[PDB]
Amino acid sequence: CTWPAWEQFKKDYISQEGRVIDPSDARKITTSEGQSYGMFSALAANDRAAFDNILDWTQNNLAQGSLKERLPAWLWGKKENSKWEVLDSNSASDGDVWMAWSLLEAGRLWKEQRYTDIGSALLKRIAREEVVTVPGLGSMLLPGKVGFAEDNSWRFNPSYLPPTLAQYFTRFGAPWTTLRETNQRLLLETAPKGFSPDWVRYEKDKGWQLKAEKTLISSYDAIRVYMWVGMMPDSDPQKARMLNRFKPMATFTEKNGYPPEKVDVATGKAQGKGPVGFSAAMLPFLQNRDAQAVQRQRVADNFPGSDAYYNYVLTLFGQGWDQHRFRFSTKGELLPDW
Amino acid sequence: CTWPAWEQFKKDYISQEGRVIDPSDARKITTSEGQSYGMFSALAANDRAAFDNILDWTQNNLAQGSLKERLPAWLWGKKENSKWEVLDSNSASDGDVWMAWSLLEAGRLWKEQRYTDIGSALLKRIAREEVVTVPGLGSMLLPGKVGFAEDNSWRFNPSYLPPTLAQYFTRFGAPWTTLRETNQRLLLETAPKGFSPDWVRYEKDKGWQLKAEKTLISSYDAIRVYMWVGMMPDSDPQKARMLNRFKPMATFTEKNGYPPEKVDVATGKAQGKGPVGFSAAMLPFLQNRDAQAVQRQRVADNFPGSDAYYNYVLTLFGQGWDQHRFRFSTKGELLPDW
Amino acid sequence: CTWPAWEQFKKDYISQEGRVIDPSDARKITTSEGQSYGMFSALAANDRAAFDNILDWTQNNLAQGSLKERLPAWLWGKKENSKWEVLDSNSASDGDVWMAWSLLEAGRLWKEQRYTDIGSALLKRIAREEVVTVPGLGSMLLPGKVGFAEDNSWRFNPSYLPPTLAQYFTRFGAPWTTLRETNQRLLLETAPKGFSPDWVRYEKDKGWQLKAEKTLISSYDAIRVYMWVGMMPDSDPQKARMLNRFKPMATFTEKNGYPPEKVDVATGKAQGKGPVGFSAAMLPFLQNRDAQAVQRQRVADNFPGSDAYYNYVLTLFGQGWDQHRFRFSTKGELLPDW
Amino acid sequence: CTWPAWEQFKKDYISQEGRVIDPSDARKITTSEGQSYGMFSALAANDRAAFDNILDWTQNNLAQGSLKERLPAWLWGKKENSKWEVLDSNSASDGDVWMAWSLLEAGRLWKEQRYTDIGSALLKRIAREEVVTVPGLGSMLLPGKVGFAEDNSWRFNPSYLPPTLAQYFTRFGAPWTTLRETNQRLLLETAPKGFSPDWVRYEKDKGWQLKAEKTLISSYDAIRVYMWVGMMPDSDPQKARMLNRFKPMATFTEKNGYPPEKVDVATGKAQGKGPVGFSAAMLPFLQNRDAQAVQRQRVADNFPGSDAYYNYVLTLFGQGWDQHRFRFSTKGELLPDW
């Protein structure tokens, strides 16, 4: 009645106070992303004590005491003066939405109104402070409260809103109704060679900027897109569209035995061999039983240790799904394996 | 470039002299089955030193110095006088055929004529000492050189000849050409309720004896049948028929979350919960992704230790194919993952 | 060149930010004693990065940013309102003096003026705020800055000032010179049956209060007294007198094979078997070659895990001394084993 | 109620059948010494199941079925033809005497007449087949049944007969009475520079051959002599004489922090650093409380793994004595710690 990979992640990456630590940065940082991934994993494992401790740390240290009052700062860690505090008070909306979803599903599944209330206040603040109306698209999720919107252009991160989370949020009405449809546009229209970009810009009156560009590559952010798509229920119509769109990533992984590290989104030119977390991300995405067992072998023989936050969380998501640690319903709800 | 489950099995179950030890028996036995499984696993791991050591011990201690001269004795262990020697000189043909196949495929893949010579001499002797012509069937593989054939009846063990091995042996002509077809008959015609029996008798003029009987149950022997069927390539025409015949075993494991320990073959009534090795045996057999993931979780969280020979060898087979440790071609050859 | 027991203590008990955590208290506390023991052990291990991290945390969280400005609060942990802060701002002078000694010896051995400046300021403040003149004795070290000196009743803790630390501090003049002498009086005059008390009172015009009393027992605080005596160099003239005074503790441990949990100081009656850390504390204190080995075997076979802060630090001191992890010179300096 | 180092030694070095395996040798050998050390350790550990298993293997495979009928072959392992059998049927008298003592003390302590009968038969055969009268000495223990006694040049090994065993055997009368004395002569008269030789010759008239020679060095055999001396009871008159004779070995180890690998017995010149087993052999021998703890640290931090039979059995003897796993009485009996 435990999730062993989650138990090891707690022992190596989560402090006694409840903060998720990326040991590879010299400042030993916590991100709102890491906190939200801890909350998700604790929910899926039915680990309410860990959920509460992580939530407490998040509220006290990223949100000045309350997620009902402000979106969490995305970056926390050690300053030069030996003090540990917020390093960047801007938000990161992938952290924000995973937090809000985890809180709402914890409130529903553990029958705790407090979680529902916090997750509701959080989601409404996401809608009012990070969602904006983009001419030519409609409502769109910005990657953060500031820095991604100009007068005539906007920058988006396809990995930030999993289609299952978007489906779930539609129950709360606008703007999530529209976001479920504009998120599908973001995923399907920005992969001209079958690879989703880490980052992509949209300009008023012109559309997506898909000419070759430094951050228009499929690497560490975008590897999650394929994973989120793999996690969709087979009865979701968008799933087949999305799997067909990204088929060249699956094809590459099948032919070479590994996912690439970086893919030029405009040319489809691949470089490097992705780390173990990328192979974990391929487990829900790949549909052939044999190609899946190649990635399943690579994850099992190179399982991340304590020096690799991002490989470990990618493995929690991808290998966890591979072992039925959680599922998503047709309404985007958690179907727990408790 | 190692198979970790296999390396652990070597360290906990195989002596320095190359004998595979079942620790649960007070006589600390070795079987021809265990030796053949060790040879198979060593070939699949590309572990030629282990293979040579285990073959040496087999020839010296089970075959009085040569598998070319006699089928291996099936049971070796400690006698009451403190001496360690053969306990039963009869053969077990599942060990015999796995030995023969492993020797032939090692000769081919490692380009070593000695292995081919021993394997061919072994297979020829199997054909001449344990295969007999049964009125109503044709050539049939007996479970053992003696004790399974009377004047008008015979007793068979469906688990002994995996279809991929039978397909491989056809290349050597008769009787293996016929045995490939009569093995299918043995598997398909003795499972009236969708469950294969550990043991089943055939009487001249009467046919299969499928009335309820103590050993006409699907338990520790017959669990391998499903696994062997799961390991057939999809391009094998027999595989669809066999999967369909045994669908009630899959259906039970999907609905309940575990394979059963014992199923009455005449009624289909099932009892108990099978050990972890049975869940491993289900991994190649189950076609549903979710049911396959449930069994995968059970194998991962209850992986066999040093006190469970049979669960471990079933996990080597079942979890090893789940992780692409070996594949069988359409002609029954080893497609190695080296 | 590492100290494995210390490496394991860091991984199980010291937070990334440098706080030493006692997991057995539900508030997950840090004490000034824990911080000072971590500083000592990092110095002994030649672990300067750990030393700096622990020092930073101590200054920021126990000393409002600076050990030059105040003695550290002795108790920090989780409050009922979910925040983490000082729980009791009173000092504990055992942590204070271990911290000062460690800083001064770090300054000397690592040639860092900053450690010397902090240690000197801390030691001078200990003199000003915790040392008082007691009629009949002279200068005396109080267990803390408030609560231990009343109308005519002072309360002292014999385990607080190890004779080697007192020797080291004499280099700074008064009150440490005379203190070295009053500490000997405290140790030698309050053990009428050969056992040192956890706590003992001195009353004006009456003297030591040595009538049986709840806290006049040799238990969890006092076990350190024997250890500190065992750690004195054989060339310290006080050593032989103390070993003779405390001989009944050694005789008990030798005759019974374990140290007692609780001894009535007034009568010598012992109750219970001390935990593993008590056996580690006996290692420097014993002088036969047969009793020591018995205690060594108990520590080796019952080595503390992750749920046992006090057993673990007692083991770092006593087993670390038993493996030559540090020595004390005749002047109380660290003779490091780097 | 287990001896953890012995439990691990069984798991890594002792086969299921009960043979002690040296893994460094390509023939994976068992020696009579290894079997005797396994028997001793199992007795010390009160592991009667291991003792019986090891004794069974010893009798069946080194003594053609019975230690009552012949001394054990000293060397057993794999031949080039792949079979496993006796490699040298000559004896090694160190294994012989440890096996005899262990059987006699198992018979006495476990009240089992069978062990006494076998041990007595073995000891009387040792006297008949390996003990000879040497002009100028008297009865002497040869290192083996054949090859160590010629025209007038006998060869002896000072490490073979521990003084505690010689004391124990005196209870059986001649030749063990005088032997006890000539063994003292051998140890005290062949170390002119304070170091005992691995091997030393004696010639009629000319006496001990103590001029420098390739085998007249203190190395892997002779390291045991110091350890056996250290294991004598303090009330044995011979112990102080032997400790004084061998003072230079203790002085070297104290001054340098490690025992040497090889010492010229004629000059006292030392070379190299002895492996961890030599440090363990110094634990009973070294008499300071602070020297006995540098070596203790070296054993703790470099504890032998699975690839180091000799270091491991030296550690079982030396660290086991250091932890009170066994003691010897003034009559050479086992004082068990059970």
Residue numbers in the entry:
A (entry chain A), B (entry chain C), C (entry chain D), D (entry chain B): 23 to 360
What text comes from the article?
Phosphoethanolamine (pEtN) cellulose is a naturally occurring modified cellulose produced by several Enterobacteriaceae. The minimal components of the E. coli cellulose synthase complex include the catalytically active BcsA enzyme, a hexameric semicircle of the periplasmic BcsB protein, and the outer membrane (OM)-integrated BcsC subunit containing periplasmic tetratricopeptide repeats (TPR). Additional subunits include BcsG, a membrane-anchored periplasmic pEtN transferase associated with BcsA, and BcsZ, a periplasmic cellulase of unknown biological function. Cellulose is a common bacterial biofilm component produced by a variety of prokaryotes, such as Escherichia coli (Ec), Salmonella enterica, and Gluconacetobacter/Komagataeibacter xylinus (Gx). These Gram-negative bacteria synthesize cellulose and secrete it across the cell envelope via the Bacterial cellulose synthase (Bcs) complex.
To our surprise, however, we discovered homo-oligomerization of the cellulase. Single particle cryo-EM analysis at a resolution of about 2.7 Å revealed the presence of BcsZ tetramers, in addition to small monomeric particles, Figs. 5d–f and S3g, S12e and Table S1. The homodimer interface is formed by helices 11 and 12 of the glycosylhydrolase-8 fold. It is rich in ionic interactions, including Asp344 and Arg318 of one protomer and the equivalent residues in the symmetry-related subunit. Combined, these interactions create a square-shaped tetrameric assembly with the cellulose-binding clefts of BcsZ subunits at opposing corners facing in the same direction. However, because BcsZ binds cellulose in a defined orientation, the 2-fold symmetry-related subunits bind their polymeric substrate in opposing directions, Fig. 5e. Oligomerization of BcsZ may optimize the enzyme’s ability to interact with and digest cellulose to increase catalytic efficiency, as frequently observed for carbohydrate-active enzymes. Collectively, our results indicate that cellulase activity is critical for cellulose export.
